[PDB]
Amino acid sequence: SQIRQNYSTEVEAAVNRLVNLYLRASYTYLSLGFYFDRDDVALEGVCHFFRELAEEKREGAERLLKMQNQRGGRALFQDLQKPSQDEWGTTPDAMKAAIVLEKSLNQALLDLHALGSAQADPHLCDFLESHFLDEEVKLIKKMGDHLTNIQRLVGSQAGLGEYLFERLTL
Amino acid sequence: SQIRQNYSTEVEAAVNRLVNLYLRASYTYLSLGFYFDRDDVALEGVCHFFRELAEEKREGAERLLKMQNQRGGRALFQDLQKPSQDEWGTTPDAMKAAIVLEKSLNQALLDLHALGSAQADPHLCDFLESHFLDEEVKLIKKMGDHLTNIQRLVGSQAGLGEYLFERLTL
Amino acid sequence: SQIRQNYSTEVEAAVNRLVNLYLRASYTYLSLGFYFDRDDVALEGVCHFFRELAEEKREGAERLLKMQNQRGGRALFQDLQKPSQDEWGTTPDAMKAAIVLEKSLNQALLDLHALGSAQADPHLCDFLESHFLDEEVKLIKKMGDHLTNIQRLVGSQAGLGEYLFERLTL
Amino acid sequence: SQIRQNYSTEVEAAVNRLVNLYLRASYTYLSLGFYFDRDDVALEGVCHFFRELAEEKREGAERLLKMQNQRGGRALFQDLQKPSQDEWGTTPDAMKAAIVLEKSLNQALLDLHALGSAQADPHLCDFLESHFLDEEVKLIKKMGDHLTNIQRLVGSQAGLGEYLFERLTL
């Protein structure tokens, strides 16, 4: 309360939820990464792609937690739900799941921004714009590009297509 | 449609128009630059000033086109109207025309921002602020400074004033 | 008129037309480049190839404009017609369109050279030979090579062929 | 006669005349340069400009003489006529005289090229194009630029205009 200024309880709570969403996405990417590292899947390029995203999402959560404290809010942690799947199929299946996941994070950021706008919290709005919004847009475009390329390949010859993509793109 | 999210058809269309405006300004500056390179005009400093702006405006158009694709919109190109004049008069005449042109681009950016705000598109709003708005303000101030200096000189002795400005300022 | 010497009004006008043709080719390549940058097309190698040609054609137009002024002629700008297509199909379709475009520029250069010869303007003839003719021949050969390679690939397996070409040649 | 091949006696003679024209232009520029070095004229920038041209024209004559021997022709030297004037007036007067002189050299080059074309001597034609034609065009444009600038200055205030041009342009 000593430093808190123009920071609504509604934004404070939403921020805590967003932290949980980012940590859950990070957990999800950790599962995806290790699945492609399995000897009966063995696509190193995909394993690395997803393991790098797990780190990025974790870093996003830490940035939000730092902001929470900077504004005088209080971080509250909740249980982290296990990933939705235990096995992730093939490369196209995995990339599709990732795009859906990212679109859900992006929507949560947009909703939080709308809330900040309604509450008249310009610091929050700038923070999201400067560290999250552009990052999400660029990432989603990249995934879209990948999906297109994977689909053009696995339409031709599945096994061969997955290998070429992992070797030449990732 | 695979990556498109929170990107209205109204903004998509406005973006395409803005691209056309930037390319037309670039074409205009190309004409201005080469006019001052004429043997019967011969003011190298002015030629370079305008040719550098032609490049800047072209780069602005390319940045908008990249953004269009990043958001999942589709670029549509239209004819580019020739510059409004074939001959540009003297330095003060040319600088006045340039300021008018820039103010028109600035207004188009402001209108697009207002549209993005009404549509609740925070990525668009940040993109304009971060890459266009400040750039325009700084450029317009510079042109204003130039105009003031050129006018103080050509009020004294026209031919002599134009030469001194080109030699000592540009 | 002070510096103008042995520079016919017929060549002066033809030069202005050629400038318009080069700027239109540049505009065309800009459209081609951004089309391959679309998330539902996504062939970075092709995007870069065409975007590099847009720059080359623009530079050709600027070289002609500089020459115009050096000879004492006057540059006159016209509207730039939008590219002939909004969507460019697949890699082979795009490369075919590009070859047709280049052959048309090459013919315009040849016609201008013939005009210069008829007018007895050796400076013009050398200028074209030294900066345009060899450049066009080398470029057209390269495109021919590409077409042959793309066709040998997409005859086998289309999607797979386009990906391999973009990854291994471009 | 041992090495001579496809080298007409008409071109051989014309080459000898051209050598005389270049040496005479060099002599003319030497006079112009030293005139501006006079204590009662004293414009160092102009002195240097003309003295540099005297060297360039001399080098042009030596290049022609080397070519003459390379083709198996025989150099024949004639008297060199003194410059047309002993005193050169002011900067604008001198620059005007120089432009007239250059246009006369350029015409002689064009006439020689026409002769080479009629004689079907492609080596001569390339030699002129590669070492003289573009050089003349660029130089004449520069002089045109200077004249324009000098005239805009001396229209304002003569003495002051000549000084500024010499200080800021040359």
Curated annotation (Swiss-Prot), chains A, B, C, D:
One of its GO terms (biological process) is intracellular iron ion homeostasis. Residues 52-59 are annotated as: Catalytic site for iron oxidation. It comes from the Eukaryota. Fe cation binds at residues 52, 55-56, 59, 62. Keywords: Acetylation, Cytoplasm, Cytoplasmic vesicle, Iron, Iron storage, Lysosome, Metal-binding. It is found in: Cytoplasmic vesicle, Autophagosome; Cytoplasm; Autolysosome. GO terms for molecular function: ferric iron binding; ferrous iron binding; iron ion binding. Residues 5-154 form the Ferritin-like diiron domain. Transmembrane segments: none annotated. One of its GO terms (cellular component) is ferritin complex. InterPro entries: Ferritin, Ferritin-like, Ferritin-like_diiron, Ferritin-like_SF, Ferritin_CS, Ferritin_DPS_dom. Its main location: cytoplasm. Stores iron in a soluble, non-toxic, readily available form. Important for iron homeostasis. Iron is taken up in the ferrous form and deposited as ferric hydroxides after oxidation. Also plays a role in delivery of iron to cells. Mediates iron uptake in capsule cells of the developing kidney. Delivery to lysosomes by the cargo receptor NCOA4 for autophagic degradation and release or iron. In horse spleen the light chain is the major chain. Oligomer of 24 subunits. There are two types of subunits: L (light) chain and H (heavy) chain. The major chain can be light or heavy, depending on the species and tissue type. The functional molecule forms a roughly spherical shell with a diameter of 12 nm and contains a central cavity into which the insoluble mineral iron core is deposited. Interacts with NCOA4. PANTHER family: FERRITIN (PTHR11431), FERRITIN LIGHT CHAIN (PTHR11431:SF47). Belongs to the ferritin family. This is Ferritin light chain. It comes from Equus caballus (Horse).
